[PDB]
Ligand binder design. Structure first.
Ligand code: CDL
Ligand code: CDL
Ligand code: PC1
Ligand code: PC1
Ligand code: PC1
Ligand code: PC1
Ligand code: 3PE
Ligand code: 3PE
Ligand code: 3PE
Ligand code: 3PE
Ligand code: C14
Lengths: 115, 341, 174, 100, 174, 66, 168, 51, 96
C-alpha cells in the first residue's frame, strides 16, 4: 500500500482473528464477580463462605447472562461506531484526503546526540 | 422511605418533578419542575422530634426559593431579549441563569448553605440531597456555553471543598464538603462531554449510595463513633473501609475509573491547567478521607468494653455488601462497559 | 414597515365615495343588504383572508361599497320614512341595538320592502353560516415544502455494519 | 428553542407550553425557523439560520421597529429644541380612528 | 398619563417597602403595591381577567399572613421617620413633574390592547377572555393542568404532614 | 350498612353525591349526543368564513333550516 | 473605547507601559474587590461605614502594589537588555513577593511569594512564547453519546414535516 | 437632515428579510401614531379603559 | 435604550425585593412578605413576556399556583418552627 486511504484503514478486512478470551472473558469475569459478591455477603453476615449455594448459583447465572447480553450490546455499539466513522469519512472526502506515503529517504529529522 | 407510605409518595413526586425538570425544552417547564421537586423535598427532611431538622429544612427552603426566583427572572429576561428558548451569543442573562443554577447545585462560592444545613439531617436524606437534587440544576447547566463562570465555579469548588473538609470532625459536614469537591469534577466535565458527566455522576452516586449505607445502618454521625464501632472481625472493618480509598480516586478500585475518564476526556479537549489544579485538590480530599481510614487500618484499637454484638438490618446490609464488592473489585468490569467509545 | 421599494396605491384611487351611515342605520336593513350584496362581500372577504394584503382586493372593496350604496339608494327612493322609523326605533330602544326590542316597525319596514321590491327577509342565522362561492380569480398556490440539500445526515438503517476492526481500540481491551 | 436532555414521555406535555403557533402573526416565521432547527439542528442552526432567526426576533420582539420609532420621535423633539420645528406645527396631521 | 402615575406610585411604594421593619407596614405597603400592580397589568392585556385573578390570589394569601402576624410578632414597635417621608414626597413630586413633562407616546407600552389591535383581526371580535384562556383546557396542555391538580393535592398532603394538628395550637413560646 | 349511616349523619353529602352522579351520567349522554352527530361542524360559525368550491371544507357545510 | 479597555498583550512586551499598568491593575482591582466583597460581610465584620472602606483599601491597594511593581520590573528588565526571556518575569515575581513582604512585615513570606510568583511568571512567559493557551476554547464538545437521534422516547405522534432533503 | 437614514429601514439595514420585494407587512401601533400627539393615541388606544 | 425604556423598571423592583428578602430582619414572616413582593414583580415581568405574544397568557395562572404553593410551604415551615422552637427569630435558629 503506497497510500494511507482512510477507507482502507477503517474497513475490517477480516485478517484480525479474535483471541481465545474474546467471546468468553466478560461472562466468566461477571460470574466470578457474582460468586465473590455472594461469598462477601455470606462473610459479612457471619455465615460459612460456601453455606448458601443457591445465592452463589443465582448470582453466577445473573452474572453470566448480564455479561453475555452486555457483550453483545458492546459488539453492536462498536460496529455502529465504526459505521458512523466510515460514513462520516465518505461524506466529507475533502477534509480527509488521500495522503502520499513518505519514506525516511526523503525526510531530514534532527538527530539528538549525547556526548 | 422510612416509617410511612406518604414518604414513598413524596419520593414518587420527587422523581416526577426532577424528570419533568430535565426533560423540559423550555426554561419555564424546567422551573415548574424545580417547584415540584422543592415541594416534594420539604416534607422529607422535616421531623418535629428533631430541633435541627426543621432548621435544615428552612435553610433548604430559603436557598431554593431565592435561587428559583432568580432563575425565573433571568429566564424571562432571556425570552425578552432573544425570543427563543436559548441564546445565540452568550450574554449576562445566561450568567444569571448559570448563577441561579449554581446556587441550587451547591457549588462554590454559593456553597455556604450546603454543609451548614447537612448537620441537621439524617443520612438517607443527605444521600437524597447530594445525589438526586444535583440532577436537575447540573443538567440545566449543560444548555449554557459559558467557560469563564463555569471555570471559576470549578476552581472555587475544588479549592474550597478540599480545604473546608479538614476542620470538621462530623461525618455529615465532612461528606458534604466531599460532595462539594466532587461537584467541581462534575462541572469540569460538563463543558467537555455530557456523557462523561453522566458517568462521573453515576459512579459518584454509587459510591455515595454505598457510603451512606454504612453510616445509615450503624448510625455513625461522628468520627470517633467509627473508632468505637464494634465488628466481630477486624478484617471485615478493614475491607469495609476501602470505599474511602475508592472515593479518593485510588486505583485499582472502582472510583479511579470516573475520575480517570474525566481526566482522559479533559486532556483530549486540551485543558491542562485546571486539571492540574484538580490534582492538588483531590490529595486533600484523600487526606481527610484517611482520617476515617485511621479507624480500620491499624488493626487493633483501644475500644469501649460494654458493647459486644453488632446489629444490622437484613435487606439493607444485604444490599450494602453487593456494592462494597463492586466498589473494591469494580475495575474487572472495565471490559464489559461500552459507554466510553 | 413601509419603505420606498414597496408600492402603494395613489391618492386618486382611494378618493371614492364611501358609506357614511351610522351604526343604527347600518343595523336597520342589514338583513336585506346581504341578500343583494352576497357576491361582493364573499369575494372580498375570501380574497382578504388568503391574500392578506390591503393593496390586493381594492377593486373588491370598491364593489362592496358600490353595492351597499346602490342598496341604500334603492331604500332611499321608496319609503324612506319607514326606514327612518325603524332606524330610530333601533337606536332609541336599547343600549345594544337588539332587533328583539321592537319588532312592529321591523314588520312595517319588511312589509314595505316586500310590497316594493318583492324581497323577503332572510332567517336569523342566514349570514352566520359558512358560505361557499365560485370565485373568478384563481386560488393562490400552496407553499412548496422548504428544501435543505445540505441537511444534518445520520446513519441510515440499510447501511452495512461489519464488526469493528481491533474491537474497541481503547486501552488494551481488544 | 432548547433541547430535551434524556427525553421521556414527560416532555410531551411540557413541549407545547409557550409557542407562537396559536393565532399569532409571527408564528409562521417561527415555524420556518423551527424547520431549519429540525433540519440543521440546534448548533448548526445558530450559524446557518441567521436570516430566519433575526426575522422572527424583530417580528415578535419588535426591536428594530421600536428603535426606528424612537429615532423618529427623538428627531422631532431635537428639531423643536434646536428651533427648526415651529411649536404650532410641531405635530403632523392625526390619522383617522377607523384606520388601522 | 395614568401609566406613568402608576410607575411613580410603584417606585415610591417600593422604596417604602424596602425600608419597613414592621410586618404590618410591609403588609399595607404590599396591599397598595398589589393594587397598583393589578391596575398596571390590566393596561397590557386586551381583557382585565388576570388582574382580577391576581387580586383574589394576593388577598387570599395575606389574609392568612395577618393571623401569623397576630400569632408571631404581634408586639413590635412602629417607628415613623421624617427622612423617609421627605424622601418619598420629594421623589413622588419629582416623578409626577417628570411624567407631566414627558412625551407619553414614547413612554407608553408597546403591548397591544383590545383597541390597539387592528380591525382585520377576526379573533379580536370574539368574547374577550375566550382565546386567551383556551389552552388550559385544550388537547396539548390539558396534561399540564392535570399535573397542576395532582401538584395541588400533593401540596395539601405536604401541608397536612408538616403541620401536625394533634401537636396543639401555635403561638410564641408554645 | 354504611349507606344508612351516611344518610343519617351527613344527608347533604348523599344528596350531593346523587346530584353529581346524575351530572356525570348527563355529561356522558351529552358527549355521546354531541359526537353521535357532526358536532364539531357547527351550523352557525363565528367570524366571517368563506370557502371556495374546490376546498375540502366546502362539502362539509350543513344546509339545515333555522 | 478608552484607555481602560486595554489588554496586557495588545502590544509587544516593553513597547507599551501605561496600557500594561492599567490592564494588570484592572485584574488586581477585580481580584481585590471580589475577595473584599466575600471578606467584609463574612468574616471580621467591620460594623461601620468607614472601616468597611478601610478593609476594601486593605484588600485592594497591596494588590495594586503587586501589579504595578511586577509590571514596572518586567518593563525595566525588558528595556535593559535586548532579549526578552523568562527571568524578567522571574525577577518581576520576586518584586511582587517583596511587595507582599512589605505588606505582611514578614521577609519569609516575601521570598516564598517571590519564588511562587516567579514560577508563575516563567510559566506564563512559556505560554506566551510557545503559543499554547491556559484556558482554550473547547474543540471537542460531546453533547451526547452515540444514537442521540435514535433515543427519542416520546408517546405523541410526529406530524409530517414541512422540510425535505430533496432538491427541487 | 439625518445622513444615515433611509426611508423604511433602520439606518440602511432592512427590518424584514426572507420576504418578497413587494410585500407589505402591517406596521406596529406606535409607528402608525409616530407623527401625532398623545390625544390621538389616547383617542384610539384608551377606548375600553375609559368606557 | 429599548431595554431601558421598556421593562427596565421591574428588574430594579425585583432587585429591591431581593435586597428586602436578604436584609437583616428579626422575623421570618417579613421574609415571607418579601417573597410575596418578588412574586408580584416576577408576575409583572412574566406578564410583559406573555403579553408580547397574543394568546399565551394562560401560563400566568400556573406561575400563580406554583408561587402560592411556595408561600404555603413557607407558612408550613413557619408552623414547624413552633413545633421545635418557641419563636421565629432568625437569631434563635442554629447557625450551623
Ligand atoms: C436605582 C433605582 C433605585 C435606587 C433606590 C435607592 C433608595 C433606597 C435605598 C434604601 C437603603 C436603606 O436601607 O435605607 C434605610 C434608611 C433608614 O430608614 P428610616 O427612614 O430611618 O427608617 C424607617 C423605619 O424603619 C420604618 O419603620 P416602620 O415600619 O415602623 O414605619 C412605619 C411605616 C408605615 O408605612 C405604611 O404603613 C405605608 C404607608 C404608605 C401609604 C401612605 C399614603 C399617604 C397619603 C397622604 O411608615 C413609613 O414608612 C412612613 C410612610 C409615610 C407616608 C408616605 C407618603 C408618600 C408615599 C405615598 C405612596 C403611595 C400611596 C398613596 C395612597 C394610596 C391609597 C390607596 O432609609 C433612609 O435613610 C431613607 C432615605 C433618606 C434620604 C434623604 C432624604 C432627604 C433629606 C431629608 C432631610 C432634609 C432636611 C432639610 C433641612 C432644611 C433646613 C436646614
Ligand atoms: C494581577 C496579576 C499580576 C500579579 C503579580 C505576580 C505575577 C503573576 C503572573 C503575571 C502574568 C502576566 C501579567 C498579566 O497581565 O497577565 C494577564 C493574564 C490574563 O490573561 P490575558 O491574556 O490578559 O487575557 C485573558 C482573557 O483572554 C481576557 O480577559 P477579560 O478581559 O475578558 O477579563 C475581564 C476582566 C475585566 O475586569 C474588570 O472589568 C474589572 C475592573 C473594572 C472595575 C471593577 C470595579 C468593581 C466592580 C464594579 C461593577 C460595576 O475581569 C477579570 O479578569 C475578572 C477576574 C476575576 C478573578 C477572581 C474571580 C473570583 C470570582 C468569585 C465569585 C464568583 O494572566 C493573568 O492575569 C494571570 C496571572 C494572575 C494569577 C497568578 C496566580 C499565582 C498563584 C501563585
Ligand atoms: C489490579 C486489579 C484491577 C485490574 C483491572 C484490569 C485487569 C486486566 C483486565 O481485566 O484486562 C481485560 C482484558 C480483556 O482483553 P481481551 O484480550 O481478553 O479481550 C476480550 C475483551 N472483550 C470481552 C470486551 C471482548 O484481559 C486480558 O487481556 C487478559 C486478562 C488476564 C487476567 C488478568 C488478571 C489480573 C489480576 C490482577 C489482580 C491483582
Ligand atoms: C385595606 C384597607 C386598609 C385601611 C386602613 C389603612 C390605614 C393607613 C395607615 C397609614 C399610616 C401611615 C404612617 O405614617 O404610618 C406610620 C405610623 C407610625 O406610628 P406613630 O404612632 O409613630 O405615628 C404617629 C405620627 N404622628 C406623631 C406624626 C402623629 O404607623 C401607623 O400609623 C400604624 C400602621 C398600621 C398598619 C396596619 C396594616 C394592616 C394590614 C393587614 C393586611 C396585611 C397583613
Ligand atoms: C491577584 C490575583 C489576580 C488574578 C487574575 C486572574 C486573571 C485570569 O485568570 O485571566 C485569565 C487568563 C486566561 O489565559 P489564556 O491563556 O486564556 O490567555 C490567552 C488570551 N488571548 C487569547 C487573548 C491571547 O488566565 C491566565 O492567564 C492564567 C495564567 C496562570 C499562570 C500561572 C500558572 C502557575 C501558577 C503557580 C504554580
Ligand atoms: C440508569 C439510567 C440509564 C439510562 C441513562 C442514559 O440514557 O444515559 C445516557 C447514555 C446513553 O444515552 P444515549 O445513547 O441516548 O446518548 C446520550 C444522549 N443523551 C443523554 C442526551 C440522551 O448512557 C450512559 O452514558 C450510561 C449511563 C449509565 C451508567 C453505566 C452503568 C449502567
Ligand atoms: C478457583 C480459585 C479462584 C481464585 C480467585 C480468588 C479467590 C478468592 C477466594 C474465594 C473463596 C473464599 O473466599 O474462600 C474462603 C474460604 C475460607 O474457609 P472458611 O469457611 O473460613 O474455613 C474453613 C473451615 N470451615 O476458603 C475455603 O473454604 C477454601 C476455598 C478453596 C477454593 C477457593 C475458590 C472457590 C470459589 C470459586 C472462585 C471464586 C472467586 C472469587 C473472586 C473474588 C474477587 C474477584
Ligand atoms: C405511588 C404512591 C404510593 C403511596 C400513596 C399514598 C397515598 C396516601 C397519602 C397520604 O397522605 O396518606 C395518609 C396516610 C399516610 O400516613 P400519615 O398519617 O400521613 O403518616 C403518619 C406517619 N408519619 O395513609 C393512611 O392513613 C392510609 C393507609 C396507608 C396508605 C394506603 C394506600 C396507599 C398504598 C400504597
Ligand atoms: C487568583 C488566584 C490567587 C492564588 C493565591 C494563592 C496563595 C493564597 O491563597 O494566598 C493567600 C494569602 C495567604 O496568606 P497567609 O498564608 O496567611 O500568610 C500570612 C503572611 N504572608 O492571604 C492573603 O494574602 C490575604 C487573603 C487573600 C487576598 C489576596 C488574594 C486574592 C485571590 C483572589 C480571590 C478571589 C475571590 C475568592 C472568593 C472566595 C469566597 C469563599
Ligand atoms: C514546592 C511547592 C509546594 C510547596 C508546598 C509547601 C510550602 C507552602 C508555602 C509555605 O509554607 O511558605 C512559607 C510561608 C510562611 O509564612 P508565615 O506567615 O511566616 O508562616 C506562619 C506559620 N504558621 O508561607 C507563606 O508565605 C504563604 C504563601 C501562600 C501560599 C501557601 C500555599 C500552601
Ligand atoms: C464459576 C464459573 C463461571 C463461568 C462458567 C462458564 C461460562 C462460559 C461463558 C459463557 C457462555 C458463552 C457462550 C458463547
Amino acid at each position: 500500500s503506497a497510500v494511507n486511504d482512510p477507507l482502507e484503514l477503517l474497513t475490517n478486512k477480516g485478517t484480525h482473528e479474535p483471541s481465545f478470551l474474546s467471546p468468553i472473558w466478560n461472562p466468566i469475569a461477571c460470574g466470578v464477580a457474582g460468586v465473590g459478591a455472594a461469598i462477601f455477603i455470606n462473610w459479612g453476615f457471619r455465615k460459612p463462605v460456601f453455606s448458601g449455594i443457591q445465592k452463589h448459583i443465582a448470582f453466577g447465572a445473573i452474572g453470566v447472562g448480564a455479561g453475555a447480553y452486555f457483550d453483545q450490546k458492546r459488539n453492536e455499539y462498536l460496529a455502529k461506531r465504526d459505521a458512523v466513522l466510515r460514513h462520516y469519512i465518505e461524506l466529507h472526502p475533502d477534509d480527509f484526503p488521500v495522503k502520499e506515503r513518505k519514506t525516511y529517504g526523503q525526510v531530514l529529522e534532527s538527530w539528538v546526540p549525547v556526548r | 422511605m422510612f416509617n410511612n407510605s406518604s414518604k414513598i409518595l413524596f419520593i414518587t413526586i420527587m422523581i416526577i418533578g426532577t424528570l419533568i425538570t430535565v426533560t423540559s425544552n423550555s426554561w419555564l417547564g424546567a422551573w415548574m419542575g424545580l417547584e415540584i421537586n422543592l415541594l416534594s423535598f420539604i416534607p422529607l427532611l422535616s421531623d418535629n422530634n428533631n430541633l435541627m431538622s426543621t432548621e435544615a429544612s428552612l435553610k433548604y427552603f430559603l436557598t431554593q426559593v431565592l435561587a428559583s426566583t432568580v432563575l425565573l427572572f433571568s429566564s424571562i429576561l432571556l425570552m425578552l431579549k432573544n425570543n427563543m428558548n436559548n441564546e445565540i451569543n452568550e450574554s449576562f442573562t445566561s450568567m444569571i441563569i448559570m448563577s441561579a443554577l449554581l446556587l441550587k447545585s451547591g457549588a462554590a462560592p454559593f456553597h455556604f448553605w450546603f454543609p451548614n444545613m447537612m448537620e441537621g439531617l439524617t443520612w438517607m436524606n443527605a444521600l437524597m440531597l447530594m445525589t438526586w437534587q444535583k440532577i436537575a440544576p447540573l443538567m440545566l447547566i449543560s444548555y449554557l456555553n459559558i467557560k469563564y463562570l463555569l471555570l471559576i465555579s470549578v476552581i472555587l469548588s475544588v479549592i474550597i471543598g478540599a480545604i473546608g473538609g479538614l476542620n470538621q470532625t462530623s461525618l455529615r459536614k465532612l461528606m458534604a464538603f466531599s460532595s462539594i469537591n466532587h461537584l467541581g469534577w462534575m462541572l469540569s466535565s460538563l463543558m467537555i462531554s455530557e456523557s462523561i458527566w453522566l458517568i462521573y455522576f453515576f459512579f459518584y452516586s454509587f459510591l455515595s449510595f454505598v457510603l451512606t449505607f454504612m453510616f445509615n445502618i450503624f448510625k455513625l454521625f461522628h468520627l470517633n463513633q467509627l473508632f468505637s464501632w464494634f465488628v466481630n472481625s477486624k478484617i471485615l472493618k478493614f475491607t469495609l473501609f476501602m470505599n474511602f480509598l475508592s472515593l479518593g480516586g485510588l486505583p485499582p478500585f472502582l472510583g479511579f475509573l470516573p475520575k480517570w475518564l474525566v481526566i482522559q476526556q479533559l486532556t483530549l479537549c486540551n485543558q491542562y491547567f485546571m486539571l492540574t489544579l484538580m490534582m492538588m485538590s483531590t490529595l486533600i480530599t484523600l487526606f481527610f478521607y484517611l482520617r476515617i481510614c485511621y479507624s480500620a487500618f491499624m488493626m487493633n484499637y483501644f475500644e469501649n468494653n460494654w458493647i459486644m454484638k453488632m446489629n444490622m438490618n437484613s435487606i439493607n446490609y444485604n444490599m450494602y455488601m453487593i456494592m462494597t464488592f463492586f466498589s473494591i473489585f469494580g475495575l474487572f468490569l472495565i471490559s464489559l462497559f461500552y459507554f466510553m467509545f | 414597515v413601509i419603505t420606498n421599494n414597496t408600492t402603494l396605491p395613489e391618492e386618486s384611487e382611494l378618493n371614492v365615495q364611501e358609506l357614511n351611515l351610522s351604526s343604527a342605520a347600518l343595523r336597520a336593513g342589514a338583513f336585506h343588504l346581504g341578500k343583494q350584496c352576497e357576491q361582493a362581500n364573499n369575494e372580498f372577504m375570501l380574497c382578504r383572508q388568503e391574500l392578506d394584503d390591503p393593496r390586493a382586493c381594492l377593486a373588491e372593496g370598491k364593489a362592496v361599497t358600490s353595492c351597499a350604496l346602490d342598496f341604500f339608494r334603492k331604500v332611499k327612493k321608496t319609503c324612506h320614512e319607514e326606514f327612518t322609523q325603524y332606524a330610530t326605533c333601533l337606536d332609541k330602544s336599547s343600549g345594544t341595538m337588539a332587533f328583539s326590542h321592537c319588532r312592529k316597525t321591523q314588520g312595517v319596514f319588511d312589509k314595505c320592502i316586500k310590497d316594493n321590491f318583492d324581497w323577503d327577509r332572510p332567517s336569523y342565522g342566514y349570514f352566520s353560516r359558512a358560505k361557499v362561492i365560485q370565485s373568478a380569480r384563481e386560488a393562490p398556490k400552496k407553499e412548496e415544502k422548504v428544501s435543505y440539500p445540505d441537511a444534518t445526515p445520520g446513519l441510515p438503517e440499510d447501511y452495512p455494519k461489519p464488526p469493528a476492526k481491533y474491537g474497541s481500540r481503547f486501552h488494551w481491551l481488544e | 428553542s432548547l433541547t430535551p436532555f434524556l427525553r421521556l414521555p414527560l416532555t410531551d406535555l411540557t413541549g407545547c407550553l409557550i409557542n407562537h403557533q396559536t393565532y399569532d402573526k409571527c408564528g409562521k416565521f417561527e415555524m420556518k425557523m423551527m424547520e431549519c432547527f429540525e433540519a440543521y439542528g440546534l448548533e448548526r442552526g445558530k450559524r446557518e439560520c441567521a436570516d430566519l432567526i433575526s426575522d422572527f426576533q424583530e417580528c415578535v420582539g419588535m426591536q428594530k421597529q421600536l428603535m426606528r420609532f424612537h429615532a423618529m420621535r427623538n428627531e422631532r423633539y431635537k428639531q423643536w429644541l434646536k428651533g427648526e420645528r415651529k411649536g404650532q406645527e410641531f405635530f403632523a396631521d392625526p390619522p383617522r380612528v377607523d384606520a388601522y | 398619563m395614568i401609566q406613568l402615575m402608576l410607575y411613580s406610585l410603584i417606585i415610591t411604594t417600593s422604596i417604602i417597602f424596602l425600608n419597613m421593619i414592621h410586618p404590618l407596614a410591609l403588609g399595607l405597603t404590599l396591599l397598595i403595591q398589589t393594587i397598583f400592580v393589578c391596575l398596571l397589568t390590566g393596561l397590557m392585556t386586551k381583557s382585565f381577567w388576570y388582574s382580577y385573578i391576581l387580586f383574589l390570589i394576593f388577598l387570599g394569601g395575606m389574609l392568612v399572613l395577618f393571623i401569623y402576624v397576630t400569632s408571631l410578632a404581634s408586639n413590635e414597635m412602629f417607628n415613623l421617620s421624617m427622612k423617609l417621608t421627605l424622601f418619598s414626597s420629594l421623589i413622588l413630586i419629582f416623578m409626577l413633574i417628570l411624567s407631566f413633562i414627558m412625551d407619553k407616546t414614547s413612554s407608553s407600552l408597546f403591548l397591544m390592547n383590545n383597541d390597539m389591535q387592528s380591525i382585520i383581526n377576526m379573533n379580536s371580535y370574539f368574547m374577550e377572555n375566550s382565546l386567551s384562556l383556551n389552552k388550559l383546557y385544550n388537547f396539548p396542555t390539558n396534561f399540564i393542568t392535570i399535573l397542576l391538580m395532582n401538584y395541588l393535592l400533593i401540596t395539601l398532603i405536604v401541608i397536612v404532614k408538616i403541620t401536625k394538628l394533634f401537636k396543639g395550637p401555635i403561638r410564641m413560646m408554645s | 350498612s354504611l349507606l344508612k349511616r351516611a344518610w343519617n349523619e351527613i344527608p347533604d353529602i348523599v344528596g350531593g353525591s346523587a346530584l353529581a352522579l346524575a351530572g356525570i351520567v348527563m355529561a356522558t349522554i351529552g358527549v355521546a349526543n354531541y359526537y353521535a352527530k357532526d358536532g364539531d361542524n357547527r351550523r352557525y360559525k363565528l367570524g366571517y368564513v368563506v370557502y371556495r368550491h374546490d376546498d375540502p371544507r366546502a362539502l362539509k357545510v350543513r344546509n339545515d333550516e333555522d | 473605547m478608552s484607555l481602560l479597555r486595554s489588554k496586557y498583550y495588545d502590544h509587544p512586551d516593553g513597547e507599551d507601559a501605561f496600557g500594561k499598568i492599567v490592564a494588570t491593575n484592572k485584574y488586581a482591582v477585580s481580584a481585590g474587590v471580589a475577595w473584599s466583597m466575600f471578606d467584609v460581610l463574612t468574616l471580621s465584620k467591620p460594623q461601620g461605614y468607614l472601616p468597611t472602606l478601610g478593609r476594601f483599601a486593605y484588600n485592594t491597594g497591596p494588590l495594586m502594589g503587586m501589579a504595578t511593581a511586577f509590571t514596572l520590573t518586567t518593563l525595566v528588565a525588558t528595556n535593559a537588555r535586548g532579549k526578552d526571556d523568562k527571568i524578567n518575569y522571574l525577577i518581576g515575581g520576586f518584586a511582587a513577593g517583596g511587595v507582599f513582604g512589605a505588606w505582611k512585615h514578614n521577609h519569609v513570606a516575601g521570598l516564598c511569594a517571590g519564588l511562587f510568583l516567579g514560577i508563575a511568571g516563567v510559566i506564563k512567559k512559556m505560554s506566551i512564547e510557545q503559543g499554547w493557551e491556559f484556558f482554550p476554547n473547547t474543540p471537542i464538545k460531546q453533547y451526547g453519546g452515540l444514537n442521540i437521534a435514535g433515543n427519542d422516547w416520546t408517546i405523541m405522534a410526529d406530524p409530517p414535516k414541512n422540510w425535505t432533503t430533496e432538491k427541487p | 437632515n439625518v445622513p444615515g437614514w433611509e426611508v423604511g429601514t433602520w439606518y440602511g439595514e432592512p427590518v424584514f428579510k426572507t420576504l418578497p420585494e413587494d410585500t407589505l407587512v402591517t406596521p406596529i401601533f406606535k409607528e402608525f401614531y409616530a407623527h401625532s400627539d398623545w390625544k390621538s393615541y389616547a383617542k384610539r388606544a384608551h377606548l375600553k379603559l375609559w368606557s | 435604550m429599548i431595554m431601558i425604556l421598556y421593562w427596565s423598571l421591574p428588574m430594579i423592583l425585583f432587585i429591591l425585593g431581593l435586597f428586602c428578602f436578604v436584609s437583616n430582619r428579626k422575623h421570618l414572616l417579613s421574609m415571607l412578605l418579601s417573597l410575596e413582593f418578588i412574586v408580584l414583580m416576577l408576575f409583572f415581568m412574566l406578564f410583559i413576556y406573555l403579553n408580547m405574544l397574543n394568546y399565551e397568557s394562560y401560563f400566568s395562572m400556573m406561575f400563580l399556583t406554583f408561587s402560592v404553593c411556595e408561600g404555603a410551604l413557607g407558612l408550613s415551615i413557619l408552623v414547624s418552627m413552633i413545633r421545635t422552637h418557641g419563636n421565629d427569630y432568625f437569631q434563635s435558629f442554629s447557625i450551623m
